[PDB]
Amino acid sequence: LAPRQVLDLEDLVFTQGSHFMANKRCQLPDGSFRRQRKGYEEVHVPALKPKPFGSEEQLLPVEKLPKYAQAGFEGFKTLNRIQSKLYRAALETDENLLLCAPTGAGKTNVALMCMLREIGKHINMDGTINVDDFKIIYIAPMRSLVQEMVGSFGKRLATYGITVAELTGDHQLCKEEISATQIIVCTPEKWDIITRKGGERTYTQLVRLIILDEIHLLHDDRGPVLEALVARAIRNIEMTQEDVRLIGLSATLPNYEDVATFLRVDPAKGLFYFDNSFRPVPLEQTYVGITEKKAIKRFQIMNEIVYEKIMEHAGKNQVLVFVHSRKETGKTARAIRDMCLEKDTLGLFLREGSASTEVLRTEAEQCKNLELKDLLPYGFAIHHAGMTRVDRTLVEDLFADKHIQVLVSTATLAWGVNLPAHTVIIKGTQVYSPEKGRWTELGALDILQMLGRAGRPQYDTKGEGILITSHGELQYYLSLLNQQLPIESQMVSKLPDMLNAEIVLGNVQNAKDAVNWLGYAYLYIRMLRSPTLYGISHDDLKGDPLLDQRRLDLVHTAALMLDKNNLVKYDKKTGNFQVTELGRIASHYYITNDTVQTYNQLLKPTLSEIELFRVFSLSSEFKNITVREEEKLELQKLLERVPIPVKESIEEPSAKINVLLQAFISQLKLEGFALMADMVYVTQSAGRLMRAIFEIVLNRGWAQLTDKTLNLCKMIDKRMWQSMCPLRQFRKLPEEVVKKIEKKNFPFERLYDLNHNEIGELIRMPKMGKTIHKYVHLFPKLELSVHLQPITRSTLKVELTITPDFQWDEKVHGSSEAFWILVEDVDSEVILHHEYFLLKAKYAQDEHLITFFVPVFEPLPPQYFIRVVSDRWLSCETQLPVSFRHLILPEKYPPPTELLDLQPLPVSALRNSAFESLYQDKFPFFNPIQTQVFNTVYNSDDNVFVGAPTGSGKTICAEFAILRMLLQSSEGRCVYITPMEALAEQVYMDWYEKFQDRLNKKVVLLTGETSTDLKLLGKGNIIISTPEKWDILSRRWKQRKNVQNINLFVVDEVHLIGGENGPVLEVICSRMRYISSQIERPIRIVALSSSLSNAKDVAHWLGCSATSTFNFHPNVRPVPLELHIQGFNISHTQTRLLSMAKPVYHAITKHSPKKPVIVFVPSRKQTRLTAIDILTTCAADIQRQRFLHCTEKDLIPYLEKLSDSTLKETLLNGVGYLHEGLSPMERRLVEQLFSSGAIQVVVASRSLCWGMNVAAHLVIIMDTQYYNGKIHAYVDYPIYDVLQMVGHANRPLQDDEGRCVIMCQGSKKDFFKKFLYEPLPVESHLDHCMHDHFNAEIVTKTIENKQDAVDYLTWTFLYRRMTQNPNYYNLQGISHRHLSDHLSELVEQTLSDLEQSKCISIEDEMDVAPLNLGMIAAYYYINYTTIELFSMSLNAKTKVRGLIEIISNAAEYENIPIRHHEDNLLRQLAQKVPHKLNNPKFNDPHVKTNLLLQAHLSRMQLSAELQSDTEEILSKAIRLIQACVDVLSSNGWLSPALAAMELAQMVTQAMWSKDSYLKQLPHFTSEHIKRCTDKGVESVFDIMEMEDEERNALLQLTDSQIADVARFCNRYPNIELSYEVVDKDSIRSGGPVVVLVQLEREEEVTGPVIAPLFPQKREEGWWVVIGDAKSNSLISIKRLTLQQKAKVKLDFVAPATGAHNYTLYFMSDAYMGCDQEYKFSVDVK
Amino acid sequence: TEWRVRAISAANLHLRTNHIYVSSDDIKETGYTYILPKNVLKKFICISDLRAQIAGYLYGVSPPDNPQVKEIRCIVMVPQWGTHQTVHLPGQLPQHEYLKEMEPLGWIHTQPNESPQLSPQDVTTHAKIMADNPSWDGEKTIIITCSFTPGSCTLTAYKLTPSGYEWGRQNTDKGNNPKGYLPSHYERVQMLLSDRFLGFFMVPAQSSWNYNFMGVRHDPNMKYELQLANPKEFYHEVHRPSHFLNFALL
Amino acid sequence: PDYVAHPERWTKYSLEVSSFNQDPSSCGEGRVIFTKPVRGPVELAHLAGPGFHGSRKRSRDHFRNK
């Protein structure tokens, strides 16, 4: 790149810092008489005459102010001059404002007006305000001012319902309280730390206004913080393209135009500058500089000057004195009083006004112990922030009411409370700065603030501000207060830290980006407008007008400094920045680079407490801290008695800071004024320093040092040693009570067992026993249980169950409690795995499950230790040893099949020309995998297993097998099984053209219905199916001959046997093997899978020989895969996604700039969010429309067919996105655009990984996790889904390689490193889901006794895996005894559960037979738990309301997702639905299903996600209701059965029972039904009988409308029922009675039911039922389908004797109002 | 009150683990051979002190191949306090479930100064433990002394002859030179350090092993229960709560 | 230091039978044999397997209409 030079930063650094002055000559004002006193030179300046009012300069009253902004202004009649002039800018415009006003002007009102405008553009009509739609940030220099502003703004805006809170200090991981408030007030560094954390985005998403109060602080040493904040804000504004208003309130100083440019403030429209003449109360300011340097005489002279100045005002005035020390206030007050007493004998009665009056008032309030008792009788009083208690709030009141005559106070009063005084005097001006280590001139900002209180705004006309300081070099205050001190930039000193923060945040990634970022800094503008002061020559400026060379040199120098400390990996050649974890920690914890270098050099895994304290002491934060000789005595005294000995360090500064930290932790007190100050400083630094050290050591993996650092952090936080009683952490307990416990050398663990009486006896205080026993159980405590199972020979899957064991108190514990989970080796020296555990108050007292993988090495360790350590509480940890004594590691897997180097097989290898024609167009040769497999898979006839990485073309091997089958047998039948339905549809679409068209062989895709499946299987050559459909089809394989005789059975993605829905695949494969064993004509099995480690087990299970097993390594893919993994060490998911947002675009630019990209995101909403973020990031760069390769004129025809606005807008810029919400046409259109090459990037949800039929050069996976509502936690992706996503990253024709970037949480990184590069090990989970398949086998008479079940278990893959990996299946040994015992126990346990539910009957403990519940469960393919629940809940009088609740409780709905924030929407819907459920848990799938079902019955319109869930629910609703009908009819309950039939028929039509039957008709509304009702039309039969013209006049009609209505009427059933009772006269008691009923429809219509709202296709099914309505008895039931003609006979036993009355019911499950009912009587003889 | 100087010195105890010398070539080939894992030895040295002896009971099992080799699988730390000459341990032998499979094999202790002979205090302690509990076989238990030398630590092992065992139980003198003490009492066994397997530690539950500072709370008749966890170093905070509490009182 | 005096005595250490696919007719070892672990009045037949045509006005009143 451009040449880079190195410039010494110290050369360009202004050494004086805040004391630097560029004014040089200082022009004094008009009145400048100088009065030398021969001891101290004095300078006097007079009050400036106020500027005369111009034309139309009247003060604007509140009446003229906007009405919505009038509230919050009570107590003020009209605005001030400055406030009035800025009224338009503050309220009528959103222009950025730079206000330069004299101190005390009242800019707070202008800020409040701006806030009022921001609120008023969120009025929300009838609603009071949009409180949660915006946020305002306030930045203030001092925390006292922060609190004052928070209080004032709260008082003002309480009328608007907006809460303003302050978040300043050491807050880390800030709670929701910041989300609750709208105006946040904090210090610049506090906001800088929050922004550095990387969680600022979720906060500032709604931020639209930031106020930079006292922005004239830029000259000070804290100026670089403000510069960085402003530059970051401007850069974010430009990137996100969201307008955020910046308003800076500044003092009247030169170079204000540079600041206005720096703030993006228009000089004509936003700059408002008012000279000191505009001050509301002009002041006569006098400056006193002491000439004499005699330190002893210095204080005497200063006190004499204060006294003589005070005596001038006498008592008819009010004098305010400011000091800069807590103890110096009383010293000054007493010294002044004593010298007034002794010098000239000046009595204090002069101060007291009108003699004794109001003296009683202060005398009454004189009863205080804060030394006010000594001064309150007189006019004197004190006011300090520290150690004042409530005396502060009373001295303020006394002085405010013009009673205190002389008040001496600290500078904190100037910010905290606004109490003006007639004259103010400032003494000393020196402040001890611990970071400087000496006495330094105090900040100009504080002096300005405390001098701006001269003169009451209402009771005074003149002001007198006297400033006492040294005569030497300290008269620059003239330049400050006389609008003569220019603002300079100090960013050169802290440039490396600011650059490192930006690099960590990702705002800059290269020297070019850093140079662009430097442009927004105030330093760049200052260099432009004043090159000479910063060392820039005029020739360089003219030859480089933008100072590009200077900026690049600065960037290069800072990059070199950062790289030297190993913070940023920076290569000079390309000028690119790489973020190191050390740099990330340094940026997050605001520690300098020198401190980071010291820590990196010193920290070792073997450090002890002594060395740890020494390393902390060697921090660069305390470099200036020295050891004062006066405090050396107390330092030595403390040095002798310390708990942690100090290594050497007799009197070095390191020893000083070390013993100071130890004395602070031990809550010791010290007698040195300076000593306590630097102790406070080192404590405040020590917090962050120790936190950063803990983070560093934790990331490095060291264990002992990690524990020691965490303990030290917690001890510093709690100010107590670990050896102390843990109950001290509760501040409520008395100190002496805990001291008594500590005196007894008694372990805290034993205190749990004792009761309150025993505790009181032991502590010897029976009264306090109850409180101690309450606080004991409040202490956090967890119980750990571990389930260990080995995955491979080198990894273990650990499931840690965490059960909280303490009472939760919101006052003590708070909203949440944090824990660290650490797993360590035997020596407890290496942290093999660590993660952050967050315990929430809502989910407290509930078991939490954590799953993680840990490695095991060749020397098998005896045990591992799992530690859960509280992040906050001391002495709160639990350690659980995980023993490996009984661990049996899995057998080492055999090497993968070698890829033979064979010349590729030409497509002409297929002897048949017709078969050649399929592929001769696609390619001339097969890939090496297909060439190697071809001989076995085509010429041979034996079973073959093919394991290859995704994208290797295993489907071609399947087609080879199919082609062999077709060649050998013309009518051969093949079955193809794919676990995913999307894959099945894709394969069907692909093979339809290949076989159905070119080869004229029938290809069918199996559907839900069994009859249609049977027809397709009968007439289908190639059958495409999912495991569940083929399972329900093949369960009765002994009856359907078509299932028995299939030539070929192909299983695709057999590696999904491990994942969810795997057991169904395992069962169907085992059943196919069993059938092949029986049928005597072998069914060839071809299994296609990913690279499997234990391919031998699968091949043995499926009968594939060793020669025919082809297990290839993952590195065999035709397109090599380049995989990169990135770890983000952020626990919070939303913050992690926000941090991942930009690295997505960076990876897109880096890896595949000009080639298609696919991005996988967890959720549907995140898809659109990520698409918009990518577009904004690309548009922020100059590229803008870079992802669109075709003209927009080409795009408009495609965009026309689209409906989603956001999708169309994104596609117009070259980025698309996909999710389930999009219509299938929309998804197909987007995929077509992506494939054609029009758009380069598409964003897809994780659930679409299988569905998509497109390939990309780059694939980016985001966060590899998704929220789970049921367990209220985040569960990572299954490894199979990750593999499927990776498989998309290959384009064999046009890509030489495929790149994939995986972004995930840091802990997950190791798991992906292990599993992705190596063959996948798959285990079985059939043991957990054994019940349903056992029940089906028992029903089908396959399992006739208990031994037959243990025989059936042998065919399964589970039996194969039990021998290889026993510990995974809770098996001890692999001996025949162990295996037989385990299998017998498993089968007995399953059969006992089956019998408990009355599904089966066990006779003589051996024989098993099915029962009605098991029979119906097998028939309807329903979990046995669901049918058990139906049997239990259903009674003889359940109504539809009960039926809906019972249905929604089915186990089929347990997997319905509970997405984030759905609880509010479901709760709102709960009111709308008719039948409200009592005690609803909204994080419960069953409640959600009930609500959605009720909404669907009520035809309510709701969100797209809820509609998608409703479709899934309605998928199974029909089978569930039919099962309920069969259950009810089994017991004989008539009314519940009819209610369930009506529930089915009204779920089909999506209406309630009370709704009129006309709701079924399409294009009918409430008024349409109302018109028909008035006429008399009540049933769908009436309109059919009604004349065309007559019915057309009744309602409004269109051609399409009336056509659809007529089409529905033709489909409406017109069946007629005629019944006959055989031998009515001759009926014998107990003898059978045959009732013959014949029904035939005259319409003879064909086609599926017309159910618009119901998603799937329904065939009408009827229920001929005979019962007695009088006794509510269901005598018999017969289900049938009409098929345009039927003849159904049902029989029953005649009960008792005599005449009986029966009611023949005819019901439907599709329509409403077509149900018929007949009554007949029979006689019994 | 030189505990601060001693703690500063003991902080740099990991360095000695870089080199370890084991006595050999003096042992008769007949008899058992004992194998010690390296990790437990390193941890034991790290948690020790230069001037105060510490001790830990040894539990082990012979490998299935041959019974002439003893593999020390565990080291048990018990509430103890030691001077520069001897270690005081509770009368109760450690008892825990994991110790059921492993037989006792003796004990291991450190000493400040390397000595050519075996300490008569060690002989007396071993003989008295043998007499008190018969679980310790006369020939299957060994004393492993890990003496501290400038730079490194020198391991060596000893066993008691029947004459030495007879003398030790009746020996009452605790001086450097007791009555009737001769080198025929002890014998040298062969010991090898091996990193081919890993051992573990068992430490007292509800307390810690070290009682040198809170010595008044140590009684020879005290009872304890073991737990599976690595021990803490000699100057760990929990081992000296009085130092932390008294400073707060200051 | 005896190690330096007599290095030969001391030794420096760095210190860092089943049967698958069973059927009811089976025999021999490896056959998994089950051993005890010693830890509807109404018949459902179907179980266990087996525009504007303006049609004439119906007789009606045999329907539910409720």
Residue numbers in the entry:
A (entry chain B): 403 to 2127
B (entry chain J): 2071 to 2320
C (entry chain T): 153 to 168, 198 to 220, 253 to 263, 303 to 318
What is the paper's account of this structure, in its own sentences?
SNRNP200 comprises an auto-regulatory N-terminal region (residues 1–394), followed by a helicase region (residues 395–2129; SNRNP200HR) composed of tandem helicase cassettes (N-/C-terminal cassette, NC/CC). Both helicase cassettes comprise dual RecA-like NTPase domains, a winged helix (WH) domain, a helical bundle (HB) domain, a helix-loop-helix (HLH) domain and an immunoglobulin-like (IG) domain. Only the N-terminal cassette (residues 395–1324; SNRNP200NC) is an active ATPase/RNA helicase, while the C-terminal cassette (residues 1282–2136; SNRNP200CC) is catalytically inactive and serves as an intra-molecular regulator of the NC helicase activity.
Here, we show that TSSC4 directly interacts with the SNRNP200 RNA helicase and the PRPF8 spliceosomal scaffold, and present a high-resolution cryogenic electron microscopy (cryoEM) structure of TSSC4 in complex with the helicase region of SNRNP200 and the Jab1/MPN (Jab1) domain of PRPF8. Subsequent addition of PRPF8Jab1ΔC yielded a ternary SNRNP200HR–PRPF8Jab1ΔC–TSSC4 complex. The cryoEM map unequivocally revealed four short regions in the C-terminal half of TSSC4 that contact PRPF8Jab1ΔC or SNRNP200HR, consistent with our interaction assays. TSSC4 region 1 (residues 153–168) lies along one flank of PRPF8Jab1ΔC, with aromatic and hydrophobic residues of TSSC4 (Y155, W162, Y165, L167) engaging in stacking, cation-π and hydrophobic interactions with PRPF8 residues. Region 2 (residues 198–220) interacts predominantly with the WH domain of the SNRNP200 CC via a mixture of aromatic stacking (F201 to SNRNP200 H1502, Y1761), hydrogen bonding/salt bridge (N202, Q203, R212 to SNRNP200 R1762, D1753, D1753/Q1749, respectively) and hydrophobic interactions (F215 to SNRNP200 K1748, V1789, M1808). Region 3 (residues 253–263) comes to rest in a groove formed between the WH, HB and IG domains of the SNRNP200 CC, where it engages in hydrophobic (V255, L257, L260 to SNRNP200 I2079, I1818/I2079, I1818/Y1821, respectively) and hydrogen bond contacts (H259 to SNRNP200 D1928).
